[PDB]
Design a protein around this ligand. Structure first.
Ligand SMILES: CC(C)C[C@H](NC(=O)[C@@H](O)[C@H](N)Cc1ccccc1)C(=O)O
Ligand SMILES: CC(C)C[C@H](NC(=O)[C@@H](O)[C@H](N)Cc1ccccc1)C(=O)O
Ligand SMILES: CC(C)C[C@H](NC(=O)[C@@H](O)[C@H](N)Cc1ccccc1)C(=O)O
Ligand SMILES: [Mg+2]
Ligand SMILES: [Mg+2]
Ligand SMILES: [Mg+2]
Ligand SMILES: [Zn+2]
Ligand SMILES: [Zn+2]
Ligand SMILES: [Zn+2]
Lengths: 510, 518, 518
């Protein structure tokens, strides 16, 4: 509970905004039939041109204002083109002599937008919102979008529009949406708002630097979230962890001034529990690499506050599930939180350590610390007697070379569970790709001295070798592992994505 | 046709062994229910012990010899276990009072062996064949295998047993003599017998690919490699055409010709065709990356771990396609037309080389800005793919040692497949299953396409920002196929067996099963 | 004499060489200290030490035939100065004839036998007194004990360090006059007199090697360096043959030819012979590594510390062998026949170069798999060693700037010697002692042999596992000498004087003492 400080100026909690200006936005969804009213703020049409690449903008919707209708005539609009993400917007007076702004965002020439296309269409909309004092935005869909992609549009808009000023020392109040078949989309709105905040909450924990967000203050934040949502919570400290013989996890934290803290939140439905799930997130608050210091070119030590992204995804999922309250499930949200540091007290390369299932592990590289903490977390998860264990983790830099920055990799011991994850990837619009656990590489983890090696010396397929290592810690339960090392941080925008909150929540709900 | 030389000691063709000692092995398959005769050479039982530890060895088969039968009693065998890859030798006198050698290889406790496990079994078998002058080997299957896995056992035995001595002169070979006979005992032998000569053809297509890949870049160059393809086409009665520089210039193959500019060997584009006698129901083009040495060009392979010493293998894709032409031309499938294509060249450093930054024009008119001369495979493939699509085929499959990133994604065991068509990808995955050459479907992520936008050219050769290079390479190749089902198999990680220091000949069987299944 | 090819008309077509140096004009007079020293024009330096007493006082013990100078040099005046090694002082006074004279001393420390390294320090101090002082004469008075070999070494070193190489100066010549006379006073002078002309010959052989080594690779290429060797043989009346590529192809020297494939200069193999007029009792071949520029080839020297800019020095072995030819041809030993060999070429990057992975055939028929084009010296030496053994000699000794690892093992002062014959290694070590060019015996460790086993060729050029690269090189070379006493001297660490930014001409005196004392 008490956060240790070196100097009195060291922060002792993570600042969190719960009430955000996005929560004050009043959303109305209208059917496009009957025509669109343009009375105030900014109205943006989402427009494509199928086949005709970079073709002219042509607005289909009737607008119940004569001045705006004249602006939206074909001869004016064709001066502009639909190239994905291209936008124009103009101020003008409407029928009432009132100043309105009217424009469009180009949606290209493919009928069905991918999540990546929709993010580009959203960023372009947010740019306008950031550069225009407005009380109201109205968005007219002249493109096809299913219910899930619509919700995704809203979540992305809310998340990209929100700006995080916690460490710095007027938003719209109304959103209107015109869309064909509007009634079918209305239930997405408040679900979007919930998903936005789980994602934004995860984002807040990830962006919070390692002097603010350390094992103590992160577990404290998790307890405060549990209290607000009425989840059961338990934080395990060093003495309990020693009792449980979590030697792999405790070894990683030996070099930190912050004591290890193991987070365990539980959601339990009111009636009968029919499925029990453990979600396990990697929770390294700062990964220096330890004695295997991140000193090689491209090792990105300055980004390593984000190594608790998996833990943050798990907590953002706890917010969504605690809010939406799925029935018939029991969900354990887990993270073995610690920091990986260089000290006289640190574990060393070569050390042999003993995990809570009795397996001795030879440490080949202190920078492969995530798999050690997850080993002990997985043994703990399995002892709960759950139906599914899913872990999420910024585990291997190799992901940038295999899937890159857009799609996370999923590995597991159970194809039905993998297919569930992939379905949740589909409906959350957070992309994941199934990657194999190749048993041929297992022999490269046979240690000469210990029961098992932490790392391969020979195999460069390190995401696969990591999965093989984790698999040794799950004996007889369906388990999947999501490596989010490549996807978690939005390098271009200099901010987290909060990747995985919606994926995991869609998994639990559906 | 004529191989240019710098000095008269420079080789002018690739040595190729067609009749190998493996071809001399007389193979006989007998049904195990008739019992086993143990009169001679070495007799090996393949034994497992299903779901049971490192359980004991117990022989199931009837053995038509009292002496041998007495030796193989459970009591005598109990001291030995079935651990995967272990083996034992026994020695005894048979009813004929003739000494015979008998033993076993352990096949584990899992009732179904993986491709990787079967290879471990075979390697153990080959150890017992090495350093033992034997006229005959007999293998008794006390484990069960489907026809595909039986064929794979034979193909693997043949390939692993064959020793390539083309480049030994003073350092042969002294004690190396092959068995002349192989006997196999298996249940329902009659259904397995067909697999024998199929395995023999598959072994040779893959060993032929291996011979081309292993041949160093002074032997195997664009001229001698295309000369070999011609000789292969002549032997198989395939139609063949090698396009030289003048014809490649006429076809405007600027991306391919740029790559070979700095080489002393003229570019040679290989085009062989197999056509079935009846109705042609399916037309397929198989395209192989054919870089006979990859120095990297002006982006020289000088970085730690860039493996320049290995770059003779950068024509492994072409070798697979030629190995497949051997299998297809030998098995003669019906209903198909198959084009076997490789844009062969060498990637060298010279006053004549293409440079980083050059803008070159592919044969479909797309201008390409070269961002790195070591991304050469995709440039040759771009013009080979334009060529392939002009043939009007149903499927185009390319195979290439294209990106070193494959080592970090799937590693050394599984190849990655990418494509623009789900049906075609699924046909490739099914061929992977039946050839037992492992492949894994990887995505073409369209979000990365924007990073190939060039300020000046129609497209960049490489990404500014994306490190997922195998995916970027796929997005690039996709720009060279307009309206045809296409898949791309990246064999950079799987082609060379780093432990055994020799090619695998990866792809030959996969591509042949693909053609045959269709 | 071949024509040197040029790219532009400004490319040089020969190496400039100075034969008649200012050192050759110096008249040397040796006098016995018992007669007293006469002190007149020029500069008279006493070499003084003080055994026991570190930095002890200077005391001049020789009789000086001049009352004024004797008064000046009395103990009372001299004791304010000390003998610290390399320390020096100048004195000015009027002698008994009222003529001003300059006198001084160099400290030789407090250890009674100076090492080769200590003597070099004394000589460097002496040279600084010669520089920037227009002197007609230097006189040196030995008040330290030196044996005949150390006396000679003093003179060789003095001559070598004093000589300034201005061949490539144009606008920046040192506006530098040399003494015309050198007087030496020493006890038992008659016994040292024979060392004077021997020192003068050894100086020139060393300085000649140095001129070849310092000549840049545009001046000293394989054609111009073999032409210089022809010219030297003509001057000394040695037999000579230069083998060109047609004859090298005929001899099947595939290893040597492969290295040179990338060069615009044809390979030239140098073969000089000295034979004594009497009955020949010993036949010796001296082989020098002759790479006129080592870029690394496709394994380009781009790694930090690869020192590509120093690689004109990669013919230092060849230079030492030609410097030896100079000494031998001049001093004319009896009862011996000596072959001076070098397989000269340039290691370059080109469409024509050999490649990592190429398999090439040496002249003894061994096939060699190229693992790294930057291990080119051992490939040229392989063929030169086969040629050398065919001559029917008693000893083969090669000398080469072969491995960078020498800098990590013995460093910049001692060369390493490896061999297959202890009697011959001991002879080299004895020559090292009497030449004062230090060498240390290093082992050829047979355990590493197995790491040169090639999967395809008869042998690997390089190890993939063993980092002891100098020993691995020696193992590889050993395979090319079948039945003859052989030794190998690796001078990679010792050839270039990094501090002084010039060659040492290392090996000339060592190899000459080897020849003479046999
Ligand atoms: C030594 C390796 C097998 C494991 C090692 N893993 C790690 O360092 C993880 O702890 C890193 N937190 C994963 C990572 C590294 C760089 C960028 C993004 C994400 C890695 O280098 O990938
Ligand atoms: C420049 C890069 C974007 C692409 C580059 N591609 C290449 O170098 C290919 O031409 C190489 N032939 C691929 C390769 C490299 C190392 C081991 C096996 C295979 C690579 O990454 O490997
Ligand atoms: C590839 C390696 C086993 C051998 C390699 N050898 C060479 O490069 C020789 O050809 C070089 N001439 C060795 C050298 C390097 C630096 C300073 C002095 C001498 C070396 O690095 O020493
Ligand atoms: Mg780490
Ligand atoms: Mg390349
Ligand atoms: Mg070299
Ligand atoms: Zn980490
Ligand atoms: Zn390549
Ligand atoms: Zn060299």
């Amino acid at each position: 509970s008490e956060v240790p400080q070196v100097v009195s100026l060291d922060p002792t909690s993570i600042p969190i905004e719960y009430n955000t200006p996005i929560h004050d936005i009043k959303v109305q969804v209208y059917d496009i039939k009957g025509g669109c009213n343009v009375e105030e703020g900014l109205t943006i049409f989402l427009v494509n041109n199928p086949g005709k690449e970079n073709g002219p903008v042509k607005i289909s919707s009737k607008v119940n204002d004569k001045q705006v209708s004249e602006f939206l005539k074909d001869e004016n609009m064709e001066k502009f083109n639909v190239k994905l993400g291209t936008s124009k917007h103009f101020y003008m007076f409407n029928d009432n002599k009132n100043s309105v702004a009217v424009g469009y965002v180009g949606c290209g020439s493919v009928a069905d937008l991918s999540e990546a296309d929709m993010k580009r269409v959203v960023l372009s909309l947010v740019t306008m919102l950031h550069d225009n004092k407005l009380s109201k935005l109205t968005v007219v869909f002249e493109i096809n979008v299913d219910k899930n992609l619509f919700r995704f549009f809203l979540e992305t808009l809310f998340y990209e529009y929100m700006t995080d000023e916690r460490f710095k020392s007027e938003y719209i109040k109304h959103l209107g949406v015109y869309i064909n078949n509007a009634d079918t989309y209305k239930e997405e709105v408040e679900k979007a708002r919930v998903y936005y905040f789980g994602t934004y909450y995860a984002s807040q924990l990830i962006a919070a630097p390692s002097n603010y967000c350390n094992p103590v203050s992160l577990s404290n934040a998790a307890v405060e979230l549990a209290q607000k949502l009425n989840l059961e919570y338990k934080i395990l400290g060093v003495k309990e962890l020693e009792e449980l013989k979590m030697g792999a996890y405790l070894s990683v934290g030996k070099g930190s001034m912050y004591p290890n803290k193991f987070i365990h939140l539980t959601y339990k439905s009111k009636g009968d529990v029919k499925k029990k799930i453990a979600l396990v997130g990697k929770g390294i608050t700062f990964d220096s690499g330890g004695y295997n210091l991140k000193a090689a070119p491209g090792s990105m030590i300055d980004l390593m506050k984000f190594d608790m992204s998996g833990c943050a995804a798990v907590l953002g999922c706890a917010y969504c599930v605690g809010t939406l309250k799925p029935e018939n499930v029991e969900i354990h949200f887990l993270s073995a939180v610690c920091e990986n540091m260089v000290s006289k007290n640190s574990y060393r390369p070569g050390d042999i350590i003993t995990a809570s299932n009795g397996k001795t592990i030879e440490v080949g590289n202190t920078d492969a610390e995530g798999r050690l903490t997850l080993a002990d977390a997985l043994v703990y998860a399995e002892k709960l007697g759950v139906d599914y264990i899913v872990d999420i983790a910024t585990l291997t830099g190799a992901m940038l070379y295999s899937l890159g920055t857009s799609y996370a990799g999923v590995f597991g011991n159970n194809e039905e569970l993998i297919n569930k994850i992939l379905q949740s990837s589909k409906t959350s619009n957070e992309p994941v790709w199934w990657l194999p656990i190749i048993n041929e590489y297992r022999a490269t983890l046979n240690s000469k001295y210990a029961d098992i090696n932490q790392i391969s010396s020979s195999v460069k397929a390190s995401s696969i070798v990591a999965s093989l290592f984790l698999k040794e810690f799950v004996q007889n339960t369906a388990w999947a592992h999501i490596d989010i090392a490549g996807v978690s941080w939005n390098f271009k925008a200099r901010k987290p994505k909060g990747f995985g909150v919606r994926l995991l929540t869609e998994f639990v709900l559906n």
